[PDB]
Amino acid sequence: DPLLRTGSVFGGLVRDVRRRYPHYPSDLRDALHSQCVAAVLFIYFAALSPAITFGGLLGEKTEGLMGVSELIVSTAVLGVLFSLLGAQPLLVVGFSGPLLVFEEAFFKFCRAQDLEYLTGRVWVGLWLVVFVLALVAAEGSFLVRYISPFTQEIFAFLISLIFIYETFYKLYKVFTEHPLLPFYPPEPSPRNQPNTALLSLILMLGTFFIAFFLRKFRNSRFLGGKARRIIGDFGIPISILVMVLVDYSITDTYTQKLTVPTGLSVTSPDKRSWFIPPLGSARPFPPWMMVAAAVPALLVLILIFMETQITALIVSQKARRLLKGSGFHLDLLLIGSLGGLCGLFGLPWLTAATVRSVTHVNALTVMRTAIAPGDKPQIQEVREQRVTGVLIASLVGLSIVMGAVLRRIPLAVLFGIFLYMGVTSLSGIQLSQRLLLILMPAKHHPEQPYVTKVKTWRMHLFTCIQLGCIALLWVVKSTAASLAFPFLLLLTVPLRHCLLPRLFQDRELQALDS
Amino acid sequence: DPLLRTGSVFGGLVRDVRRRYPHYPSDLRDALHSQCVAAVLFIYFAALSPAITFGGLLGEKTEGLMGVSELIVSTAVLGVLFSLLGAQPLLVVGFSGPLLVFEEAFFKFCRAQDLEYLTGRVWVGLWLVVFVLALVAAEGSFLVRYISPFTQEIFAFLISLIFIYETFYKLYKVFTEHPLLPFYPPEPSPRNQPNTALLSLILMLGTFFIAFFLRKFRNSRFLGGKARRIIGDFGIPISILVMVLVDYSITDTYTQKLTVPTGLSVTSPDKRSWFIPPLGSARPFPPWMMVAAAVPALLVLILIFMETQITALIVSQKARRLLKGSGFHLDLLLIGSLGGLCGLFGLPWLTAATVRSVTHVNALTVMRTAIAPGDKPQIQEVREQRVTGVLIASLVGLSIVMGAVLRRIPLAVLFGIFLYMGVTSLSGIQLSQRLLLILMPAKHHPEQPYVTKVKTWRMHLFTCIQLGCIALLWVVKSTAASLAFPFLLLLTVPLRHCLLPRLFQDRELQALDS
Numbered sequence A, B: 001d002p003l004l005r006t007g008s009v010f011g012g013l014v015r016d017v018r019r020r021y022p023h024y025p026s027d028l029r030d031a032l033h034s035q036c037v038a039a040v041l042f043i044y045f046a047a048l049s050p051a052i053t054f055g056g057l058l059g060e061k062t063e064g065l066m067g068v069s070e071l072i073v074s075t076a077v078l079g080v081l082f083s084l085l086g087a088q089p090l091l092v093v094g095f096s097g098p099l100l101v102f103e104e105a106f107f108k109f110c111r112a113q114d115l116e117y118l119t120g121r122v123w124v125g126l127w128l129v130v131f132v133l134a135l136v137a138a139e140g141s142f143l144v145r146y147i148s149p150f151t152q153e154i155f156a157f158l159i160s161l162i163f164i165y166e167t168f169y170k171l172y173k174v175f176t177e178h179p180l181l182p183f184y185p186p187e188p189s190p191r192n193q194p195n196t197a198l199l200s201l202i203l204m205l206g207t208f209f210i211a212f213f214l215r216k217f218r219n220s221r222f223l224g225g226k227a228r229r230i231i232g233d234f235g236i237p238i239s240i241l242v243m244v245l246v247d248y249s250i251t252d253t254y255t256q257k258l259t260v261p262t263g264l265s266v267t268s269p270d271k272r273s274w275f276i277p278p279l280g281s282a283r284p285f286p287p288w289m290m291v292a293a294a295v296p297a298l299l300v301l302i303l304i305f306m307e308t309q310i311t312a313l314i315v316s317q318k319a320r321r322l323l324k325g326s327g328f329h330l331d332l333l334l335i336g337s338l339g340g341l342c343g344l345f346g347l348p349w350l351t352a353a354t355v356r357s358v359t360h361v362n363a364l365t366v367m368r369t370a371i372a373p374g375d376k377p378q379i380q381e382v383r384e385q386r387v388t389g390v391l392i393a394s395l396v397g398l399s400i401v402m403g404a405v406l407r408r409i410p411l412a413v414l415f416g417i418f419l420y421m422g423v424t425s426l427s428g429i430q431l432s433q434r435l436l437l438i439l440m441p442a443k444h445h446p447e448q449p450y451v452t453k454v455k456t457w458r459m460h461l462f463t464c465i466q467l468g469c470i471a472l473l474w475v476v477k478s479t480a481a482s483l484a485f486p487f488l489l490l491l492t493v494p495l496r497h498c499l500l501p502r503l504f505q506d507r508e509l510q511a512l513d514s
C-alpha cells in the first residue's frame, strides 16, 4: 500500500527509501548479463536523437539562447542523478513537446513585456522548487489512486499515436526536399538530389522489417535455445548494423546523416555564459516579476507531475511483474528539485518519457523458455538494476566527442527504429485489444472479463467514449490552445468518477475499467 | 489403376476416354463461381509473359525466322485444343528452356550443313508424329509406374529454383542498365535514367508483400466468412491493380512496360510465309536429311514425354484430392500429334508446364471453412473443369489486339508475381520439409513416418543424395552439354531401383520414399 496516507511529514518519502534502498547490492549485481548490453545499445539510440531534434527546434524558437548542447548536458546530468538516486531507476528522463510549447510561450511573453528570458526562467525554477517541496511535505502524492486505467489508456494511446505520426512526416519532408524530377542539371545543405528519397524509404522499410522478423524468430523452433535467445536479444542492433553497412556500400548517392555539436560550449557564447545571474546581467530585474513568477511555476509543476505520475503508474502495473518496489514520492521530489535547480544554469527542464521508459522496460523483460505449444508466452521476470540508466545517460552526455562514428549513421535507419518502437508500444494497451474486437464477429471474441460479463453493444460504447476523448485531446493540441492540454487530460477523472456510473452499472464498470 | 497394361492395341486410350468423357456436363457446369474468374486472371498473366520472353529469345537465336507472334499463335491454338479434348484439362501448355536449347542447336546444325531450317523442322515433326503414334499404340505409357517420388521431387525442386533465380537476374539486369550515378546530364530504349532501378525494386517488393499478406488474411478471424473467402480469392489481382495504380500515379520517371506485337503477321514477312512447303522453297531438299530426321525427332519425343509425364504425375498425387480422373495415354497422343503438325506452319513445339500447372491447380483448391484453431487447414475439394484453360488460351491469343491496355502494366509487378508463384510452388514438396528439419533440433521433429521409423542421421543422408543430384543437374545444364539433361534426369530411376536398396533397408526405403 504505497498510496496510503500516513499523517506525518515526509512519511511517504521515508517509507519509499526504507522499502527500496536495502536492495542496492542486488541492483548492482543484477546487471551482469548479455540482455543489458542490448538494452543499452537500443535505448541509447532511442534517447539521443530526440535531444538533437528538440535542441534544433529550441534553438529556432528561442533565437539561439538554448540549443543542442544545453539539452544534452541537462539530459546527461539529470539522467545520471535520477538513475543513481531514484526509487524507480527504470524511468528515462528527457525533453518532450509540452515543455517546448511552454518554453515558446514564455519566450513570447518575455519578449512582449521587455524582460530577460533566462532570469525569468531562474525565478520560475526557484518557485517550482518551493512548490514541489511544499507538495511533497504534505503527502500530496496520494491523489494518484484516483487515476483509473481510463486516463492511463487514453494518455498512452495518444502519446504512441503522435510518436508514429511524426516519423512519417519526417520522411514526407525528405521527399519534398528531394523530389523526383525528369531532369537533374549539374550544379548549404544539398537539395534536389536524385535517388535520395527512394533510398531513404528503402532503408526505413528494411530496418523495420529486419527488426520485426528477428523479433518473431524468438518463438520459432530453429537452432538451439541459447542461440535463439541471443539472436532475439540483439535483433535491433543487428538491424541497425546491417542497414548501416548497406548504406555505406553504396557510395554514389547523398543521404542525410547524424550531426552533433563538437566540444562542450554554449550555443551562443556572445549572448550568454553558462551561469545566469539571478539579479540581472545588463538590466535590473523588477521585483514584480520576482513575485509573479509563481504561475508559470505552477504550470510547469502540473505538467511534470501529470507526466511523471502517469508514466510511473503505467510502468508499475501488476501484469508486468514489478517486484523490487515503486516510487511515488522520491521520484517526484528528485525530478522537481533537479529541474528547479537547472534554471540557474540556463538548462531546460526534464520529465519522464513514456515511450522511452515503456521500451526500456520491454527490452529487459525475460520470457519463459518453456513455451507451451501453440500458446502465447508469459513473462518470467523483469530485470531491475541501476546500471542501464546510468550507462545510457553517460553515453548521451559523451556523444559530443564521438561525432566521427555518429556521422556514418543515416537517419532512415533511426526512422525505422522509431516505427518499430511506436508499433511495439501500442500492443500493451487494453484499448488496442478492445479496438481489434470491433472488426471480429461476436462469436470469436476471447474469454476476457469484459466480454462475458458485458453485452457486446455495451462494451463498444466505452471504446467509443475513449476514442472520442483521444480525438478531442489531439484536436486541442493541434491548435494554438495547446497550453491547456494537461488540464483537459486531468478533467477525465471527474468524467469517470461522476458521470460514468450514471450510465453504466457497477458490475459493468468493475470489469470494463480495471 | 490407369497404369496397368491390358494387352490390346489402343486399350489405354479407350479406357481413358471411357473413364473421363461422360463427366463432360459436370465439367461445363462446375465453372459457375467466383474463384474461376480469379484463377483465370492470375494464370493469364502467369502465362502471357513467358511467351513474350521466349519469343524475343527465339528471334535473337534464329535470326528472326521464329518470333513472338508465332509463339503466341502456337500457344493459343494448342492450349485451346488440349483443354477441349484433354483428359486432364488442368495442365497448361507452353514453351520452355529445353525446347529453346534444342531449337538453337538444330539451327546451328542446319546452318553448318547448308540446309533449310523450316523444312528440316517439318520433317522432324512428321517423324515425331510417327514415333508418338507407334509409342501410344504399343501401350508404352505404362513405364510411368517406375517413376518414384525421388525423381518427381528432384525435378520439381530444380524447376522452381531455376524460376526464382531468373526473376532475380532480370531485376539485377534492370539495375545494370540503369545504374545510380552522381550526375545525370541531359542528352533506342532509354538508358542511364534516374529513379528507375529503385522504383522497380519497390514495385516488386510491394506486389510480393501485398500478395503474401492477403493470402495470410484468409485464415484470420476478421470480418465474415464470405468476405474473407472473397478477399482471399482475389489477392493477386488486388496486388497487381494496387501496384499498377501506384506506378500510374507517379508520372515523372521512366519504367519499362509490357510490349506486344500488333496485328497477326509473321515476324519476317520477306524471309518466309505462314505455310512451309515440305519439298523445298528455294532449293530441293536432299532425301538423306528426309531419312535422317529421325534422331532429332527422338530427342524431341524424349523431352516432351519426360516433361509431360512428370508434370501429370505431380499434379495427380493422392494428397491433392483429384477425383474426375487422370490421363496418361490421351494427353501424350494429343501433345505429340499437335506438336508434329505444328512443324508444317513453322510454329514451335509445346509441352506441359510444371510451375504454371501447379499454380493453376493451387488456385482452384477449396479449403474447409471449419478451420480447427491452431491447426493446418484441410483440403476440401479441387474444382475440375474445362473452362479455365480455354479462357486462358483464348486470352493469350487475343492479347495481340489488346496492346493499349497491356502497355500500362510495368514489368516489376510481374516480377513480384513470379516471385510469389515460385515461393508458393516450393511448399508442396516433401524435400522442402525434410530440408527444414535439418535446422531444427531432433527433439522438435513432427510425427511423420520418415521421422519415427528412421534414425535421424539415416534420413539426412537421403536428403543429401537428393541435393547432390539436383546440384549435378543444375551444373550440367549450365554448361554447353545441356542437351543431355533429360537423359541424366531419367538416369535417376536405375539409381533408385538398383543402388539405393543396397544401402538402405526395405522399411527405410518404404518410409522415406512414399
Ligand SMILES: O=S(=O)(O)c1cc(NCS)ccc1CCc1ccc(NCS)cc1S(=O)(=O)O
Binding pocket: A049, A050, A053, A096, A097, A098, A100, A101, A162, A163, A164, A166, A167, A170, A477, A482, A483, A485
Ligand atoms: O515527442 S515526439 O517524439 O512524438 C516528437 C518527435 C518529433 N520528431 C522526431 S524525434 C517531432 C515532434 C515531436 C513531439 C510533438 C508534440 C507532441 C506532444 C505535444 N503536446 C502539446 S500540449 C506537442 C507537440 S509539438 O512539438 O508538435 O507542439
Ligand SMILES: O=S(=O)(O)c1cc(NCS)ccc1CCc1ccc(NCS)cc1S(=O)(=O)O
Binding pocket: B049, B050, B053, B096, B097, B098, B100, B101, B162, B163, B164, B166, B167, B170, B477, B482, B483, B485
Ligand atoms: O523457364 S523459366 O521461366 O525459369 C525462364 C525464365 C526467364 N525469364 C523470365 S520469364 C528466362 C529463362 C528461363 C528458363 C531458362 C532455362 C530453364 C531450364 C533449362 N533446362 C534445359 S537444358 C534451360 C534454360 S536456358 O534457357 O537458360 O538454357
